[PDB]
Structures are given as C-alpha cells and as structure tokens.
Amino acid sequence: LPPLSLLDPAEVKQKSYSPESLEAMSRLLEIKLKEFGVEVSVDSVHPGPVITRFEIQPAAGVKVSRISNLAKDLARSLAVISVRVVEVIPGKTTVGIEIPNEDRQMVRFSEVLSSPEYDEHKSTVPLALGHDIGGRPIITDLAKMPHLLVAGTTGSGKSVGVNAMLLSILFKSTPSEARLIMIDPKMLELSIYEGIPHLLCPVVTDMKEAANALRWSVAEMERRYRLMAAMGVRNLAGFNRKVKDAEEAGTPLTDPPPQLSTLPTIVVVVDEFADMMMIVGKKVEELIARIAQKARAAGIHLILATQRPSVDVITGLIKANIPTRIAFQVSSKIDSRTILDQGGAEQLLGHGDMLYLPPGTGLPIRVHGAFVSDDEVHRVVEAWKLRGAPDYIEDIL
Amino acid sequence: LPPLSLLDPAEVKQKSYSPESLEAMSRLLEIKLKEFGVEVSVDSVHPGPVITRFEIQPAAGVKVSRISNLAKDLARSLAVISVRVVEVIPGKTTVGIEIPNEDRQMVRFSEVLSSPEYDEHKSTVPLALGHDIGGRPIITDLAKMPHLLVAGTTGSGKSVGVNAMLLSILFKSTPSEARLIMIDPKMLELSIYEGIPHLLCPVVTDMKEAANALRWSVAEMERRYRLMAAMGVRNLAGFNRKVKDAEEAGTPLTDPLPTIVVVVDEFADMMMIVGKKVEELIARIAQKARAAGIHLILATQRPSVDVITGLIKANIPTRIAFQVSSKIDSRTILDQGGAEQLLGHGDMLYLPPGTGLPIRVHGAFVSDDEVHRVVEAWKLRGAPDYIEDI
Amino acid sequence: LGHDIGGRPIITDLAKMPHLLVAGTTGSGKSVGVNAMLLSILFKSTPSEARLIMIDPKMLELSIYEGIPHLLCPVVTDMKEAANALRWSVAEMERRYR
Amino acid sequence: LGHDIGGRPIITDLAKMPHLLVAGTTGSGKSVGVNAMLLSILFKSTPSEARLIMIDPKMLELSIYEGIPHLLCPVVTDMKEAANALRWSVAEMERRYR
DNA sequence: ATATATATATATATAT
DNA sequence: ATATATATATATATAT
C-alpha cells in the first residue's frame, strides 16, 4: 500500500476574506434587504471554499418566498454574480443566503485525504469527494451507498470525479479486498489504470466484449448468492468476517471439496454507459437492473457516468434500483429533476461543485470535488505497478 | 403451544423530549402562528411515536389554505424538519397539524404483540404492524384483506415487514391451522424459514420448480374450490367454518382443512425470466382465490409495467408500500400520493378494503435474531410436512 | 333505488334508461345497489318476461343466484369466456331485429 | 465575431467552446454570420491545420466555397450524401480515438 | 400578491 | 425494435 506522499501538499491561500470583508458585506445585506419589503438580521457567517453562507434570521411574518422572489435583484444589489437561497437548515431556524466568492479556491485532493475521517474509516470502499460548504470533508461508504450515478455536461469534470473515486478506492484496500472492473466506450482516459493488481479484466475496448464481462458479473453474483445461501449469512462483509474469524486456527474451511479464500469486493465502474445502452438496445439495459436489483448484499457495487441523463437512457427500470445519485453541472432543470429529483442542478458553477443525495432522502448536498491531476494518477499507478503484479481472472470475456 | 415472550421486551419509550414541556412547544406554536396573519387556539397534544399531531383550532373567518400555504415557514420557524396539515378531523371542529419529533422511538415488536385485541383476535391469521399516527395497535386481518401487495424500497424494511407479517402468522396458530409456501428468486432474505413445521412445501429456491409450485397452487385451489361448492357454501371462510362444524360434529365425512398463505416475493424475476405463464397463472390465482383461503401476499422492487401488469394489480384489494420513485410508482400500488412523503425506514401506507384513504402505520422492526429464535422454537416442535407434486 | 333528499321514493323504469353506468371507489356501496336493483327486478316479474345473464369478474357475491328459473346461463368468470356471452347477446339482438 | 457594444472585437475560440448553435428569424444575419465564421477560419489555418465539411440543405449560400483546398467533401447539396458524411465523421472520430 | 385557465414540453402506452 | 398519440406534469400571462 503506497502512502499519501505522492499528492500535492495542502497549500496556503490567504484569499479567505477579512472579518470586515464579511461584516461590511453583512451590513450591506441588511441594508439592501431593508430597502425591499423584508427585514432581517445577520446571525452568523460561514466562509467557504467557493460559495459562502449567511445565517440570517427574519424577524416576524417574513416568509421565505419573499426572499426567493428577491434573489436575483438582491444578487445585483450586492454586485455579486447570483444567489441561491437555502430553504432550510436541518435543526436550525434560520434561512441561508449562499453567495459565491469571486476568487474561488481550488480544493486539492490531499486536503481531502488529510482528515482522520478517511484513514480511520472502517470500510474498504471510501468515496472521498471533497470539502463541503463549510469546508469539512464528506466521505461516504460505497458499501452502504449502494450505487452511484454521475451526470454532467462535457467538460463539467466527470473524468475528474471518477478518478477521485477510484483513487479513493486505491489508497485503502489490498488486492484481496476490493477488485474492480472498468468499462470505457470513450476509449481514452480510463486506460491509465491498466497494470494495477486490482483490476479483473483488462480495461475494455468496446461494449462488444464488455457486455459479456457484465454477464460474468451476473454469474459472479449468482456464485455469491449460492455460497451465501449455503454457508448461511447474508452480508458479504458478514461472511468475510465469518471465514477468517472462524479460521483463526489454520484451516482452509472447505465449502460447497475445494478451499475458501477471502471474499473480495467487486466494483463495476463504467465510463459512459449511454453509448452502451444506445448501441446495444435493451439487453444491457436489462442487465443493469438485473445487477442493481440483487446487489447490496452481493458485494458488487455499480458506478455509472453518462453525458445525457435523460429518460431515453435512464428509465424507471433503473431509476428505483440506484438510490444515490451525483449530478455535475448540467444544462436544464429538465435533466436536473431527471437525475436529481429535488432539482436545482442547473445552477452549478462548473468544475465540480456537484449535487449529492445521501442514503437518507429528499435533501441534496452540495460538496465540491477535488481537482486531481493526471500526473498524481500516474505516480499512483507507478506505485502500484511496483508494489504488485498483473493479477487477472481471465476468460471473463 | 407457541410462546410470546420469546423475543425482547419493552425496554424504554424515550419520553419524547418531555412529558410536560411540550406545552411550551404548543405556546411557541401559538406565538408563531400569531406572527403570521392567523390567530389560533391550541388544544391538547397527542405525543405520538415519531410524528405528533396537534389539536389546533383556528378562529373564525380564516380559511385552511392560509395554513396550507404557510406550513413550510411554520416548519422552519418551529425548529422542526418538515410538517404538514391534515385538513379534517371527523367529529370536532379542529384542524390537524402533525410534527415529526426526531427521536424516533424504535417500535418494540413484542409491545405490538402485547396488544389486548391481538390476544383477543378472532381469526387465526392476523397481521400486526405497529403503532398509528396516534399510536394505536393496528392488528389487521388477512383473512379479511385477503390479498396483499408490497412495493420495493431498499432501505425501508421490505424484508422487515415480510418477517413481521410472518412472525405475526406464527405466534397465533397451531400446525394443523396454518400452512405457508414461499417463492423467492432472492434466496437470501427468507430461507431461514426452512425447517418450519407450518410449511406445506420445501422452500422454493429455483424458478422452474416455482412454476411447478403455482401449478399445485391452482390445482389445490380448484380442488377445494369445487369441493366447497359440493359442500354448499360460498366463501372459504364459510367452508372452513362448516368443515370445522363437521369435524367437531365428530362425523368422519372424508367425502373424497387449514388455511394456506403464499408468501412469494421478488416476483419480478418470474415475470421477466421464465415468461408469460407466470402472470397467466397469477391472474387466476389472484382474483378467484379471494374466497379460497389462498391469500397470496407479494413483494417486488420496482412495480411499474412488466413487473406488475394490471391483471394482477387490480385483483388484490389491500396494498402496502414504501418510499419509491416520484413517478407512476407513487400511485401504481399506493393509490394516492406517497412518492417521498413516506419517510421510509419505519413507516408505511396501509389501505383497508373500505375507506380508500391511506392509513399511515409506524411499523415494528424484527431482528433476524428474533427470527432465528422463532425458527428454533418451531424447530423444537418441528415435525415437517413436505409435498412432492411440485 | 331509494328515497331522495325529501324522503320521497325514487323509482325508475329500466325500459327508458335505456342503459346504466355505476361508479364508486369502493366507497358507499357498489355491490349493494346492483343487488338492490336486481332484487327489485325479481319482486315484480316472471321468468317468462325477464331473464338475466350476469358476468362475474371476481366470483365473490353474485354467484348466489344460481338455481333461479330466470337465469339463462350459470356464472361467467373469464373475460375470454364472457366474450362468448357478449357475442351471444349480439347474435340474439340480431335475430331479435330479424 | 465582430465588435461588442464597448468597441472591441470578441474573438472566441472554437477549440474550447466546443460546438455551436446559431438561430434566428429570416434576414437577421444568419448566413452572413456563417460566412464570418468561415472567413475567420480561413485566414489562419492551412489545409494541413484544418479542413472543412460543408452541408447545404439549401443551395444558396455555402456554394461559393466549392473548390477551395479546405474541403474533405464537395458541398453537400443532396440529402443522402449528408448522412454519408455523418457516418464518415463518426467513423473518423472513432478511428482517431483508437 | 395570488389562484386560474392556457400553452408548452416529457414520460409512457401502444400499434406495426 | 420503432414510430406515434395521449396523459401528465410544468412554466406562464391573466382576472381577481
């Protein structure tokens, strides 16, 4: 396992505004809202990486619609670019004005790995995404996720997000914990990971070979179901406890008479499945739901990314089988509601700053990404290709 | 002889943030509504399990839409999550507003079983689910429901509700009274129910054998269904009542019998994989089996078009679901608007056969260890009964 | 049918409906009302004047009428069975007009 | 493109934008703007550096470019050859990816 | 300001 | 498998 040292360090940026730069801002906000029909008091300020909150508490009889209908004029009042309005803080009575900083601050990925939350996260599939609105890192478990969608326009950063999630996978698990299968119809960027001791097939060329490896994923799911129905327990990690935590004393624990190894995690990462669903038809569309309907205890998790998120490629046949979604900067509230049912993803800044709904419900989370360089990736790839070997399960195609 | 104290007792009830100072919450609500353009009077609080309904009496002249257009800012004012308004109470003149206290008291299943009418229940196959909006015991009866359909939500307890219903079956029968049979392509969440003496079938793992199981299902159906017309009643409740009054008349008629439930779930894989013969059989073990004792609960993950066609949707009277896509799924099974207002992970929308409005139920969790204790307690008194026509 | 809002009896003639559509969302009574009209047919009739044919989707309740001397066929269950009865009615109407 | 309102040409790159929609009602400047974009391309790029593919659904404007050394195809007046050009473009895109 | 009728735009049911 | 229509949702100028 290679260390954290190959990334760029946590630099120093003094662009974090002065307390006067927020205080005069806050008094100017109170003056400008007092010039309209509303009346409000700034209760707290939270600075941020790019956008910046304002905990404001309206006095009495001041409905939030009288802020959300002043929004654009308030934005031109403070001479900033635009303002989204927080409808509710969870647990706290105040509404929030989100104002983006002009000099936005890029968040390096080693800053995301710098938390004690990452390295002392008990799971084997962390998904380090980046610092939130307030600046705290939010890293969530893929095993409890259980699946992800990624959508955004061209250039909006989906390659960077997928590289961030994959390097989140790489730094924590051994080869015998979490294998992965990569599929890329846009045959250009995800070939960079070829050579690691984690990656089952070679990183594929066409869907013509990759659909058969996805049927192999189906058969691996059936192997997993047969062996967990036989040996008794339900979760994958429950069974992987059950094997070694029975064979403290040395035994292979023969099973339905071959041996028993550990039970690794499988992660299907797909670059652009819109191409695959278009150029095949509905067979692969059936395969995706057939995976994602029987997966959470199977230890096969699905990462998808597209470019058009419309219902031509993501039907209701998938839409209830992948709860957790991420959308990057998109072009329409149509597509916004389509892959983020709350809607609001058309107001993104670009270059990361995605929406995210947790494994709760109905409440999107705006968390910035991590600008991961390709050379950081190349260092990590060299560090794995020295610390390992070309391990493969062939005849997967 | 089934035991009832086999599982864990009522440990705590969490006190719901106060037993007394929610009067302060009520006064704060009064002040917050007077801050807007209504004047209101608050009567006594119903401190429910998770949510909490308030007796709220508006003054004269005001309409209820001035509460409905004001609910969200009432909610952000009152330091709570998400409230809504019930615009009618049958009886008195008040207006209901329900508020979700966040400390969700996890519903102790043996406390649901400790209900007096659960012990005093007439039929032999009841369905206990838990507490209501006010928190009442909600023991229903699938001898009267008598078909049930479950939708799919990955994190709500679709498995937990099935095991709750099955333990509800188990603690109120004798082996010569209840029979069950399962079909599940996910052979994972349910196969702990092998070794049950209440069975009348081996636990069906495959699907061609499930197509052999539904054949014996309709065969037994039409067998007893024309035998019932031979014995001259109309419904199978009448059939079992009269064969009870015949066997406990002491006469050995034997002219050529217990209940039978079909706890098939994940039925989408049958209706997608093996073919159309599944739904062609399910349509006629669906509608006609109503007064036939075969009650046929069902559960899938994504009910829209192929998974449920209308000739299986319509026959089942009474339905149950969890939080699903904000699309046609929101009312395909649920019959109302329940897209994401159902919280999931504890609550559910019940429909009785009459009064087609969704009664919302606080469900009760069941540990898999509780399931294993019940499986082992029936495994002690565990003489099986398999049949091999399948 | 019953009484109106004044409580005066409201009885209609089926020969001048000429047909009838019944609604109800498992609400007030949808089985009742059909049963009511059918028993009201039966109390002023003879089988040489009015014989009925029912089609039963859910064989629940009106599989109770079997045995009466005005019922031209037994209970009908399948819709594919019921299409034969509907085409029988069309053919009977056609020879009726002939 | 030409000037903005504050007296400066705003010359935007096509290699980053990276595609383009142009629309408007008749006579508002459509074919003139297309000509401006084309002559903007032509005064820097040799046929080594760039080369055009042109499709005319109307044989009125983009017919003058017939015979410049910056064409991969003749000016597509026809309709089926336009589909052929799009097939070729997808094929050239995929082989350049490989 | 705010509920109403209208025009536009999307997702699904279905004929070939 | 593909093209077509209706139902449903959604944004918009208006009389209240």
Ligand SMILES: Nc1ncnc2c1ncn2[C@@H]1O[C@H](COP(=O)(O)OP(=O)(O)O)[C@@H](O)[C@H]1O
């Ligand atoms: N967090 C970020 N901060 C700044 N720029 C970013 C960030 N994430 C992505 N980008 C920019 O987005 C571009 C990548 O977009 P890309 O994923 O290639 O879109 P597509 O794959 O659809 O073409 C990169 O050039 C990168 O500079």
Ligand SMILES: Nc1ncnc2c1ncn2[C@@H]1O[C@H](COP(=O)(O)OP(=O)(O)O)[C@@H](O)[C@H]1O
């Ligand atoms: N009353 C409850 N309290 C706590 N958790 C619950 C309760 N009811 C259900 N759950 C949760 O529901 C989950 C079960 O989901 P499940 O029915 O297995 O979905 P699926 O079958 O689609 O995987 C469990 O993880 C459990 O934590």
Ligand SMILES: Nc1ncnc2c1ncn2[C@@H]1O[C@H](COP(=O)(O)OP(=O)(O)O)[C@@H](O)[C@H]1O
């Ligand atoms: N006037 C009445 N007073 C009291 N109960 C009635 C009255 N009319 C009908 N009902 C009851 O209401 C029930 C409504 O049933 P119904 O909606 O017809 O069931 P279904 O929709 O399955 O036919 C009837 O079964 C009947 O017993």
Ligand SMILES: Nc1ncnc2c1ncn2[C@@H]1O[C@H](COP(=O)(O)OP(=O)(O)O)[C@@H](O)[C@H]1O
């Ligand atoms: N910058 C300009 N100055 C003056 N006239 C112009 C200018 N741009 C366009 N026009 C007029 O508009 C016409 C181009 O419109 P065109 O592209 O033909 O629209 P369409 O093709 O829809 O008819 C030209 O013939 C010219 O007369």
